[PDB]
Amino acid sequence: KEYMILISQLEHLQRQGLLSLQKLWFYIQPTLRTMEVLASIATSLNKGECFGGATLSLLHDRTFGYTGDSQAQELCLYLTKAASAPYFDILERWIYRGIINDPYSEFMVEEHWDQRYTIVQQQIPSFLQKVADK
Amino acid sequence: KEYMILISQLEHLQRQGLLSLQKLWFYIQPTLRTMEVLASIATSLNKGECFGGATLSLLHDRTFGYTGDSQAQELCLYLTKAASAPYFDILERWIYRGIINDPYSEFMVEEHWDQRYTIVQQQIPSFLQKVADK
Amino acid sequence: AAAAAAAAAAAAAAAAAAAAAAAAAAAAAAA
Amino acid sequence: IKKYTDQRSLDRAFGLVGQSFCAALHQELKEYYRLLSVLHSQLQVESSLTL
Amino acid sequence: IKKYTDQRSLDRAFGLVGQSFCAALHQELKEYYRLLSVLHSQLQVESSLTL
């Protein structure tokens, strides 16, 4: 929504049309930046085929790597925070009653006398296995 | 830079048929006075291979002797204040803190109760000799 | 919502036209 | 500077500092382009065009 | 959506539930119509009318 709204605002200056190949070139180098990070997350997701906590640990690794550019850090933080607020809500909905619901097995723990909750090695939280055992 | 904005000032005059050699030489007369003091600054800087306090000494006596022309005094006062205020800041932290680090042997005081520091005779300071001893 | 985001990009275009008009004054008062 | 950004493309490889240095090199590349846009506004009609 | 409200019309046949979901589906339709009025009040040219 933020990408498509700048393009319409300079089109108000296109009815007074004098804008350049260069004034446009400056605004596209910030918005190639926004799109190239988004493409390179998407390209990693096509090669990956992860879901659940395996996606959560991949996005936690992108908070490490994309540091040095402030605004590439801010989206990679926000993408991790928007992937964890579903996941840790599925955590909390397992803590208050023990409601294990699996649309496509988002959470790791599957329902088994048995005592067989057996975390999974398929997925892991944003932290290491110590909090998964916890 | 201030030369080359006066360059762009005169083609603004030149954008019609108006220009004689002496309408324009009222710009050449301040600039001829400019280069002739600035190159005679720049000649004393170069062939003597001057480094250290002697450059600060040299620009100080040019400001004393040039009482005659006010424009010629104004440049070398700016030259002796732009070349010494870095050098004044280097002694200022040296007398305030008490630890020295010359990157390219910039100061008159170099390394060598039993720790010695000595005024070199390559750099002869613009200051007084007792106050360099102090 | 959608009108508020249209005003945020309009404020970015206003500082753009102001930065270009300031350099145009340096191209018209020293020229 | 364009070829330095072309060699910048890593996951984050052999150094966390290396593309941080090119991130600022993209910020000071960025400052050159605002000086190009104030030149194009000189070019069309909306000063004299001498070199 | 407009045809679904036309085949809705029963006395109340085979369900109270199915003709509340339709009433919700007409409650969804009033939100598509409020968009059509704000863009026609956006049409005021005397905003630019581009596609």
UniProtKB/Swiss-Prot annotation, chains D, E:
Known partners and oligomeric status: Interacts with gamma-tubulin.
Taxonomic source organism: Xenopus laevis
Compartmental location: Cytoplasm, Cytoskeleton, Microtubule organizing center, Centrosome
Protein name per the record: Gamma-tubulin complex component 3 homolog
Family (UniProt): Belongs to the TUBGCP family.
Span within the parent record: 303 to 363 of 906
Gene from which this protein is expressed: tubgcp3
Described purpose of this protein according to its UniProt entry: Necessary for the recruitment of gamma-tubulin to the centrosome and for the formation of a functional centrosome.
